[PDB]
Write an enzyme that holds these catalytic residues in place. Structure first.
Site, PDB file in Angstrom:
ATOM      1  N   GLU C  59       0.819  -1.208   0.000  1.00  0.00           N
ATOM      2  CA  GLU C  59       0.000   0.000   0.000  1.00  0.00           C
ATOM      3  C   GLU C  59       0.854   1.259   0.000  1.00  0.00           C
ATOM      4  O   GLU C  59       0.359   2.326  -0.378  1.00  0.00           O
ATOM      5  CB  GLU C  59      -0.971   0.043   1.181  1.00  0.00           C
ATOM      6  N   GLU C 136       9.058   5.307   9.142  1.00  0.00           N
ATOM      7  CA  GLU C 136       7.696   5.248   9.676  1.00  0.00           C
ATOM      8  C   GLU C 136       7.609   4.373  10.918  1.00  0.00           C
ATOM      9  O   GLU C 136       6.907   4.717  11.874  1.00  0.00           O
ATOM     10  CB  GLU C 136       6.723   4.726   8.617  1.00  0.00           C
TER      11      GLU C 136
END
Ligand SMILES: CCCCCCCCCCCCCCCCCC(=O)OC[C@H](COP(=O)([O-])OCC(O)COP(=O)([O-])OC[C@@H](COC(=O)CCCCCCCCCCCCCCCCC)OC(=O)CCCCCCCCCCCCCCCCC)OC(=O)CCCCCCCCCCCCCCCCC
Ligand SMILES: CCCCCCCCCCCCCCCCCC(=O)OC[C@H](COP(=O)([O-])OCC[N+](C)(C)C)OC(=O)CCCCCCCCCCCCCCCCC
Ligand SMILES: CCCCCCCCCCCCCCCCCC(=O)OC[C@H](COP(=O)([O-])OCC[N+](C)(C)C)OC(=O)CCCCCCCCCCCCCCCCC
Ligand SMILES: CCCCCCCCCCCCCCCCCC(=O)OC[C@H](COP(=O)(O)OCCN)OC(=O)CCCCCCCCCCCCCCCCC
Ligand SMILES: CCCCCCCCCCCCCCCCCC(=O)OC[C@H](COP(=O)(O)OCCN)OC(=O)CCCCCCCCCCCCCCCCC
Ligand code: HEM
Ligand code: HEM
Lengths: 102, 74, 445, 60, 53, 380
Positions: C59, C136
């Site tokens: 994604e 992240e």
């Protein structure tokens, strides 16, 4: 017989004896949770006056003395300062209790 | 837990004390004691004494009634 | 105008199935804006610890170019029409959604079709979002709630594919390559595990025509001829504690096993959570909150916040509470929380049951305000229940809940059970597992 | 059809009050049966030596 | 029990706690019978009464 | 750095006796409970010096008591000090209880309950200690009290046989009463520590009934020297009672050896039991008399739920003051009736006194508080 009851009330107020210590009627109330919440909601000048009156009464009781007769708390100037705060506290507590009933 | 320093909030109170070595142990003892003893007696005697007076009366009545009960009945 | 015919006046969700097995569902409304999304039944539960970060990394790569719109060009035609593009992935679901106007429906259907079909992957992009996902994960390590919930999933589902996170460990994102991503796409992006949901000003006929024009070919054949199944996950009563005393606050989550997606008793459990509720330090209420736990927490200044949760998965789930507080309160808070649970197992009266029913009614209806939560509800409902449950059915299911069945369900799921505890921060006063295990039953009852 | 500890827990051990009730009932059953077994064993060790083994030649 | 327990929530709480209180009273009764070893109850049992206790 | 606030043994002494905040206006009545502790300690010490020569067998109990009073050096001083110290202990106990009743000190509920448990313990200790010298009235009072304790149906006879260790009061009863009289004051001391702990959790009470937090003083040196003066005064009455009149509070008939064949014409316990005995003679029912005794002790524990006023002490409640002095007067009447023969007119006087006692404590005092609240414009 209203004046008989009123004069009997003056006699009972003089015979209770807390006017000889400079105390008001609202100082003599037993500090339960509702009464403690009533003291907590007081303005600071009335709180300081009440605390000085309790301190003066305890100092007088320590020496087993009383105030002079001109310094006694008269019946007409005995202000019921704690009555609306205590009334609001009892009303709120009864509202909470009646909500907890249902 | 409930020691000094956090018992109550007191504002604007001034307190005065002397050393015990500057003041008398018995300052004007009877001249201020006998009026105060008489005053305290005056405030409390009408609420203390009459129960003990009627106890004395019942005690004497019971003693004399017991002695009359032990007595002969011609 | 009562509540029953108000809930009956909600438009019916229209569901059709294409010839490949793709579900297509729509919710027609009066709005000038629409939300169209694609839901794929593929998450971290569908991974075999060699492709443990495949969904997150895919994604990340999904909006970086296709075989028909290479580079940022598709970005231009989603930013020149004002559309907002979003995607997310949970442990068992994946969603790619576009919110746009009603006029741009064929274009957003075309972009959603070719993003999930012809996503172009290149090795420079592989390493670019490899370092991006490393950064992240380094950012997400500092959010203590995410760390605690990952700890709870790790210790409550030990040895099962539900323990592994969506992101996966750092060694996989340093070692995943193009071939494993292609294998994941060939194994998981199929029509019988795909729902195209639309909400807003969308007619079902136009959406069905665009889905037949674009999403007709998805390669729904099992190429490897191996069946991908979903084995049940074993719940484990356990505890994980991460002692680190430099953190300012402690997060503790305690949860027991949930019944699943298709269990009706979840509805009753929702009412139970509505009795316990939630609290945050910025709440404007104060002492007079209805929940006893929040009232005692604000009276004794115990917790920074608490919140209840009922996470559901296929046949399983996590039903529990999460609180952040300082260290000196922790055990006390645990005690009060446990008492509340046992109160619902023993002394649930009709007043708080009615209050929880009203709270669940308001939250479950007002959550579906807008095209995005309606589209999310359609996609998740068609993926989980196999159908979209109407809102009047939820009203009828809430209505049958009284105090007797609520304490029956609470005694079934909370009483004398072995929980899972995850702690992070100054958690020294957080007790052993034995005291928490002893807190799940009353000697007086 | 579960195991007998499963239904034993679900009917006897789930609630604390009936847990204590079955502790008391099993306590009185256990004291009766254990006194029976213990006097049986102590009788079996000591044939011909106890008073109750010989109170027929003298009781009359 | 002056005025604040005169409510329907308290009555349904008491009705919820009837079986637990009854089971605890049964526990106390059986424990008292076993501990004080009462003859007037243990004479109507199938197994304990063989010792007369 | 100082050992008063740091050393864990001295920390408790500092926070209980040295730096404990106390109201500045508590009168001499607040001495009495502290006096009670000293009395208990004195009794224990004298009891220990009585245990070094007492032989607890029926053939050698009275003879051992005479050996204490006649051959042991100052053994008469120890024994009569023990007896008169028990009497002065009950004097201090009665005044401590009456002060707790007058100044509204029963709002400290846990302190009051530990107190009434202490009262039951010291009454049992005194009864068994009076059984110990094995006189005529010792044996006969023991027999009377236990065979009226036998009045519970179906349980009473087995209980009094198991208390007796036999069919009546005998050697087993004397030995077990010596053991129980020895063991009880240490339990009393532990309960007194719990009593003081429950008091020090919430602070003490002043005679005005107000909040004493506005004016509080350290316990030392003020109440230290006040308690020293009270201890000296208590020792003055105790030494006057033991050194001049050792028998105003005793009974001559206990100087005879115990005779089961001979019953005395009049059997009575000590004065601190006598009023209860009067209540025990008030109701002509056995079980009703036993419950009258037990409730006559236990309604003091019941009185924290009988407070219907918004003012704590009786300093500003004169009608309840009058009714309280009527109650103390009734207690004196019951104490006099309890040592009287069971003969007219003492029956109707004792029945009237018991009725007045239970009516004043149960009925009239909350009504007096309610009407005092009404006259102070507080009650609706
Ligand atoms: C009466 C004539 C004298 C007089 O009027 O003196 C004024 C004085 C009262 O005057 P005041 O200044 O208004 O009162 C404050 C006191 O001065 C301040 O003193 P106080 O009243 O606080 O005294 C504390 C109290 C402390 O009392 C105790 O410690 C007693 C504790 C109880 C002991 C056991 C008692 C019960 C035994 C029953 C059996 O003392 C007494 O009760 C008397 C102590 C006498 C010591 C020996 C004097 C020579 O009265 C006395 O001192 C009376 C006692 C001496 C006579
Ligand atoms: C209403 C009528 C009341 C009548 C009585 C009271 C008023 C008249 C009092 C007259 C003076 C009495 C003695 C005063 C006094 O305390 O003198 C001693 C005081 C102080 O003496 P003192 O206090 O050291 O006396 C000894 C006190 N004891 C025994 C307690 C140690 O003054 C002088 O001696 C000078
Ligand atoms: C000797 C001749 C009489 C000398 C005393 C004369 C009066 C002097 C002053 C003393 C007054 C005492 C008044 C009575 C005190 C009292 O409480 O009596 C209750 C008694 C009441 O007892 P009772 O006689 O009613 O006894 C029956 C009691 N009941 C009703 C409960 C069943 O009063 C009397 O007896 C009234 C007559 C006076 C008797 C006292 C003689 C004393 C000598
Ligand atoms: C004896 C002394 C009687 C006496 O002097 O009483 C009056 C006195 C007044 O004191 P007070 O009302 O507090 O006011 C002081 C000034 N404002 O009031 C007091 O001193 C109050 C004394 C209270 C304690 C009295 C105890 C008497 C004995 C009771 C024994 C039985 C107790 C209950 C047992 C069941
Ligand atoms: C030793 C014998 C001689 C003793 C000395 C005699 C007195 C001499 C000196 C007198 C000096 C008087 C000075 C002023 C004193 C005032 C006393 C006082 O406060 O009296 C009020 C007191 C209580 O009144 P209250 O209870 O409200 O009345 C309703 C009836 N219960 O009201 C009363 O006390 C009056 C009513 C008493 C009722 C008693 C009932 C007993 C049964
Ligand atoms: C553990 C400490 C105690 C011991 C060892 C003890 C021991 C004794 C002994 C041996 C006697 C019989 C000697 C005698 O004739 O006086 C006795 C009598 C007595 N004791 Fe104690 N005692 C103790 C504590 C108490 C306490 C706390 C009380 C008060 C409740 C008490 C009240 C009495 C009484 C009233 C007598 C009867 C006095 C007499 O008849 O001569 N004793 N004690
Ligand atoms: C065994 C005998 C007893 C001992 C040794 C004892 C000891 C004490 C002590 C040391 C205190 C603190 C000092 C004081 O306030 O005077 C006290 C206070 C108190 N006691 Fe007792 N006590 C005894 C019996 C009782 C009984 C029978 C009661 C119940 C009626 C009682 C109720 C209280 C209360 C209410 C207080 C606190 C009142 C106040 O401080 O103002 N005590 N006791």
């Amino acid at each position: 017989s209203s004046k008989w009851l009123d004069g009997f009330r003056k006699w009972y107020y003089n015979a209770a004896g807390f006017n000889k210590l400079g105390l008001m009627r609202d100082d003599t109330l037993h500090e339960t949770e509702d009464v403690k919440e009533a003291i907590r909601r007081l303005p600071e000048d009335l709180y300081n006056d009440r605390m000085f009156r309790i301190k003066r009464a305890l100092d007088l009781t320590m020496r087993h003395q009383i105030l002079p007769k001109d310094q006694w708390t008269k019946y007409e100037e005995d202000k019921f300062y704690l009555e609306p705060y205590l009334k609001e506290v009892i009303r709120e507590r009864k509202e909470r209790e009646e909500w907890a009933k249902k | 837990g409930r020691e000094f320093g956090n018992l109550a909030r007191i504002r604007h109170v001034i307190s005065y004390s002397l050393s015990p070595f500057e003041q008398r142990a018995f300052p004007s003892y009877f001249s201020k004691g006998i009026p105060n003893v008489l005053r305290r007696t005056r405030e409390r005697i009408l609420r203390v004494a009459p129960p003990f007076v009627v106890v004395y009366l019942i005690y004497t009545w019971g003693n004399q009634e017991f002695e009359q009960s032990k007595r002969k009945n011609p | 105008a009562t509540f029953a015919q108000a809930l009956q006046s909600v438009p019916e969700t229209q569901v059709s199935i294409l010839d490949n097995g793709l579900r297509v569902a729509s919710e027609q409304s009066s709005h000038a804006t629409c939300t169209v999304g694609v839901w794929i039944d593929a998450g971290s539960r569908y991974e075999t610890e060699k492709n443990n970060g495949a969904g997150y990394f895919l994604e990340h790569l999904a909006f970086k170019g296709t075989k028909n719109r290479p580079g940022n060009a598709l970005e231009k035609e989603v930013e020149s029409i004002g559309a907002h593009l979003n995607a997310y992935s949970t442990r068992e679901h994946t969603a790619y959604l576009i919110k746009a106007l009603s006029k741009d429906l064929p274009k957003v259907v075309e972009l959603l079709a070719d993003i999930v079909q012809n996503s172009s992957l290149e090795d420079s992009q592989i390493e670019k979002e490899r370092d991006v996902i490393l950064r992240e994960m380094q950012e997400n390590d500092a959010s203590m709630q995410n760390v605690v919930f990952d700890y709870l999933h790790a210790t409550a589902f030990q040895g099962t594919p539900l323990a592994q996170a969506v992101e996966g460990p750092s060694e996989n994102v340093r070692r995943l390559s193009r071939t494993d991503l292609t294998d994941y796409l060939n194994r998981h992006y199929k029509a019988p595990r795909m729902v195209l949901a639309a909400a807003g000003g969308v007619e079902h006929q136009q959406l069905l025509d665009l889905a037949q024009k674009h999403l007709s070919s998805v390669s729904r054949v099992y190429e490897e001829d191996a069946v991908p199944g979903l084995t049940p996950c074993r719940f484990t009563g356990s505890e994980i504690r991460h002692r680190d005393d430099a953190l300012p606050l402690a997060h503790v989550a305690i949860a027991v096993e949930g019944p699943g997606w298709a269990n009706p008793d979840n509805v009753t459990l929702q009412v139970a959570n509505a009795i316990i509720g939630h609290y945050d330090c910025t709440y404007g209420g104060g002492v007079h909150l209805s929940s006893p736990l929040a009232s005692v927490a604000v009276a004794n200044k115990l917790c920074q916040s608490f919140q209840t949760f009922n996470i559901s998965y296929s046949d399983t789930g996590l039903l529990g509470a999460h609180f952040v507080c300082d260290a000196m309160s922790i055990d006390d808070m645990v005690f009060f929380l446990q008492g509340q649970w046992m109160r619902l197992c023993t002394s649930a009266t009709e007043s708080e049951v009615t209050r929880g029913k009203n709270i669940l009614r308001n939250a479950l209806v007002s959550h579906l305000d807008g095209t995005t939560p309606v589209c999310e509800d359609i996609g998740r409902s068609l993926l989980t229940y196999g159908r979209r449950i109407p809102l009047a059915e939820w009203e009828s299911r809430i209505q049958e809940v009284d105090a007797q069945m609520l304490r029956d369900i609470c005694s079934k799921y909370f009483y004398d059970q072995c929980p899972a505890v995850a702690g992070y921060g100054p958690i020294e006063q957080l007790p052993d597992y034995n005291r928490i295990r002893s807190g799940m039953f009353w000697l007086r009852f | 059809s579960p195991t007998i500890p499963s239904r034993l827990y679900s009917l006897l051990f789930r609630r604390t009050s009936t847990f204590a009730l079955t502790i008391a009932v099993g306590a009185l059953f256990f004291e009766r049966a254990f006194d029976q077994g213990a006097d049986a064993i102590y009788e079996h060790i000591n044939e011909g030596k106890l008073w109750k083994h010989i109170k027929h030649k003298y009781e009359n | 029990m002056l005025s604040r327990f005169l409510g329907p929530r308290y009555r349904e709480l008491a009705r919820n706690w009837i079986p637990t209180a009854g089971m605890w009273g049964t526990v106390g009764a059986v424990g008292l019978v076993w501990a004080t070893d009462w003859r007037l109850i243990l004479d109507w049992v199938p197994y304990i009464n063989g010792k007369f206790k | 750095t100082n050992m008063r606030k740091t050393h864990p043994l001295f920390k408790i002494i500092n926070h209980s006796f040295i730096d404990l905040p106390a109201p500045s206006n508590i009168s001499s009545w607040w001495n009495f409970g502290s006096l009670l502790g000293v009395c208990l300690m004195v009794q224990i010490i004298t009891g220990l010096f009585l245990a070094m020569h007492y032989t607890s067998d029926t053939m050698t109990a009275f003879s051992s008591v005479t050996h204490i009073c006649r051959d042991v050096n100052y053994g008469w001083l120890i024994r009569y000090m023990h007896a008169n110290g028990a009497s002065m202990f009950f004097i201090c106990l009665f005044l401590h209880v009456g002060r707790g009743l007058y100044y509204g000190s029963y709002t400290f509920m846990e302190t009051w309950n530990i107190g009434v448990l202490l009262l039951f313990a010291v009454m049992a200790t005194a009864f068994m200690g009076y059984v110990l010298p094995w006189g005529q009235m010792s044996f006969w009072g023991a027999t009377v009290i236990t065979n009226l304790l036998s009045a519970i149906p179906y349980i009473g006879t087995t209980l009094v046989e198991w208390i007796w260790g036999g069919f009546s009061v005998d050697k087993a009863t004397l030995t077990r009463f010596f053991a129980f009289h020895f063991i009880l004051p240490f339990i009393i001391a532990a309960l007194a520590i719990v009593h003081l702990l429950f008091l020090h959790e919430t602070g003490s009470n002043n005679p005005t009934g107000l909040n004493s937090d506005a004016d509080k003083i350290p316990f030392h040196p003020y109440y230290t020297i006040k308690d020293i003066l009270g201890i000296l005064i208590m020792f003055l009455i105790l030494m006057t009672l033991v050194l001049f009149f050792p028998d105003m509070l005793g009974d001559p008939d206990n100087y005879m050896p115990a005779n089961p064949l001979n019953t005395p014409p009049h059997i009575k316990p000590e004065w601190y039991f006598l009023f209860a005995y009067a209540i025990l003679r008030s109701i002509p029912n056995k079980l009703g008399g036993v419950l009258a005794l037990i409730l006559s002790i236990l309604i003091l524990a019941l009185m924290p739920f009988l407070h219907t006023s918004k003012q704590r002490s009786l300093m500003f409640r004169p009608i309840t003051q009058i009714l309280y002095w009527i109650l103390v007067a009734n207690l004196l009447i019951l104490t006099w009736i309890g040592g009287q023969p069971v003969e007219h007119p003492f029956i109707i006087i004792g029945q009237l006194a018991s009725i007045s006692y239970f009516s004043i404590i149960l009925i009239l005092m909350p009504i007096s508080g309610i009407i005092e609240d009404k006259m102070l414009k507080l009650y609706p």
